[PDB]
């Protein structure tokens, strides 16, 4: 029962995304398959269903690492901490075993940490007001002394309750997360394909960020932020 927000826990947070997504599946999946097919792996809409479910179920699982809890307790600032990057190493191996390949596990491990605040891979002009910096987030990563035992079996508690594929969890201590979060970024940055590893990764990102209706609103432009939340007319009655 690890809480994910100030007053909202991760448990109801997951069902908030499912209750946002039961209708989004009939709009993007036929449109996401046709753009996914460029990478080489191909499957029907049924496999895409489970793929998008696996991505939505683990998107911010790194929020319980005895760091976010000790920061969002009363008033402690994050000090430029990134909560979800470690989730990437959780989203790398899980797709390795249930798809039995790598070409579709890599894109998942990227899209799972393209959200929230993506990492800026250099090439700055003269300034950066925000904290999109690998150098400052490595300092906050250095204090990651593993994860609590409460999340060791907790990962078995949401995958079996909806579909059920296979039980498997990794064991982060200091370095297995390191040489994976670095290798995924370095492989995604430099490949012969120039713009695919950007447009396709964003295309997979787009359905994952429907969380605004799931959580509490924070901006006045909510009307324009839910244009695709609805659909066309079904019938007259």
């Amino acid at each position: 029962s690890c809480k994910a927000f100030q007053g909202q826990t991760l448990r109801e947070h997951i069902e908030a995304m499912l209750a946002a997504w039961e209708i989004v599946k009939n709009k993007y999946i036929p449109s996401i398959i046709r753009v996914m097919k460029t990478v080489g792996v191909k499957f029907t809409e049924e496999d895409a269903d489970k793929f998008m479910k696996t991505l939505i179920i683990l998107h911010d699982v790194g929020k319980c690492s005895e760091v976010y809890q000790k920061h969002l307790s009363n008033n402690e600032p994050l000090r430029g901490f990134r909560h979800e990057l470690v989730s990437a190493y959780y989203a790398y191996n899980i797709l390795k075993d249930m798809f039995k390949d790598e070409t579709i596990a890599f894109i998942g491990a990227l899209v799972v940490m393209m959200h929230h605040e993506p990492i800026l891979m250099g090439q700055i002009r003269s300034l950066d007001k925000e904290e999109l910096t690998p150098e400052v987030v490595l300092d906050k990563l250095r204090t990651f002394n593993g994860v609590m035992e409460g999340t060791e079996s907790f990962i078995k508690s949401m995958i079996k309750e909806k579909l059920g594929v296979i039980p498997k969890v990794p064991s982060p201590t200091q370095e297995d997360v390191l040489r994976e979060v670095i290798r995924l970024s370095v492989l995604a940055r430099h490949r012969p394909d120039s713009g695919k590893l950007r447009m396709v990764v964003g295309a997979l990102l787009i359905p994952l960020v429907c969380d605004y209706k799931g959580a509490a609103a924070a901006a006045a432009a909510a009307a324009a932020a839910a244009a695709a939340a609805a659909a066309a007319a079904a019938a007259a009655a």
């Binding site: 891979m121 090439q123 700055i124 300034l127 400052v136 300092d139 490949r191």
Partner: protein, 333 residues
């Protein structure tokens, strides 16, 4: 396991040709590859077939020709055409070879010609060698097209360069990282991010590009690449191609190490990021002679260098942020 053989000619040229092998095998896959260092041989150990190597080269040269023809006997303004190229005779000769392989590699035919390597890829080249008595004519160093094409592909993408012309004169500084103990796909691909495409600064306000040891800091500042050097070991090799008064010659060639500079910037840009770049850019633009004292203090841990640069720069203009001062004492303590 194939273990593609790599000829040994020059410690710098062999670096470029062997280190440029990865840009082609990435295009062809080559999973589970490695690069065992040898100081100058730098041999690639990969369990992949030779057929996909040419499939990598054809894609790489397609990218090169797409870059070359886009900009503008035709002379472009790219790294392999006029960016790092100091000699005009190679402005059109080099691309002509690059497109020549389009008539050789597409239909699966081996190379038969042999071209002349310019000085930009390998500084030891020239016109006047010494064998027993006196000099000779032309360039005795003649490189086969196979090894010739494998150098530019690694030069354009991986090794960066800085160009500062100021009208008739021209200064070109070339930096490259050479592995010395071990290296993998995580590091060689990350080093590709350091490349500065079209580094034509000119004007007069951007004069801070004077001297190579000062231009390297400016190149590194705006590239917050991977900081793996805190656990790895790498060396920086740099050379200059001066063209003062249309006089193509090399006047600066020193060997340094990049690990301590990596650690310095990593320990500096940790408390804050918005003000660190502003501070260093201000000291570089205004305190032109003072930033030399800052850069020199990095490879020797000089205490007076950390103060002289600030003293000389504050007199003109310096923001002097608070969080960055605590970053220097993190290295000092």
């Amino acid at each position: 396991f194939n273990e593609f053989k790599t000829p040994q000619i020059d410690p710098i040229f062999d670096l470029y040709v062997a280190y440029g092998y990865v840009v082609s095998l990435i295009r062809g896959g080559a999973k589970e590859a490695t690069l065992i260092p040898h100081g100058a041989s730098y041999l690639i150990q990969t369990d992949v077939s030779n057929e996909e190597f040419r499939h990598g080269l054809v894609d790489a040269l397609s990218s090169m020709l797409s870059l070359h023809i886009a900009l503008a006997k035709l002379v472009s303004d790219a790294d392999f055409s006029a960016g790092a190229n100091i000699n005009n005779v190679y402005w059109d000769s080099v691309p002509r070879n690059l497109e020549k392989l389009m008539k050789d590699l597409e239909k699966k035919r081996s190379v038969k010609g042999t071209a002349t390597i310019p000085i930009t890829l390998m500084p030891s080249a020239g016109k006047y060698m010494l064998k027993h008595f006196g000099v000779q004519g032309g360039n005795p160093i003649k490189v086969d097209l196979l090894n010739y094409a494998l150098a530019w592909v690694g030069f354009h993408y991986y090794t960066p360069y800085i160009k500062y012309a100021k009208g008739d004169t021209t200064w070109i500084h070339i930096y490259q990282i050479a592995p010395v103990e071990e290296v993998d796909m995580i590091s060689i691909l990350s080093l590709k991010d350091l490349k500065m495409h079209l580094p034509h600064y000119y004007e007069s306000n951007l004069d801070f590009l004077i001297n190579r040891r000062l231009a390297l800091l400016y190149h590194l500042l705006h590239s917050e690449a991977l900081e793996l050097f805190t656990e790895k070991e790498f060396v920086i090799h740099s050379y200059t191609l001066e063209r003062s008064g249309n006089n193509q010659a090399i006047r600066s060639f020193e060997e340094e190490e990049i690990g301590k500079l990596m650690d310095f910037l990593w320990k500096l840009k940790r408390r804050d990021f918005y003000h660190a770049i502003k501070f260093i850019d201000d000291l570089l633009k205004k305190a032109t002679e003072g930033a030399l004292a800052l850069i020199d203090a990095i490879m020797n841990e000089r205490l007076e260098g950390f103060y002289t640069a600030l003293k000389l720069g504050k007199k003109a203009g310096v923001v002097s942020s608070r969080e960055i001062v605590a970053a220097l004492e993190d290295i000092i303590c």
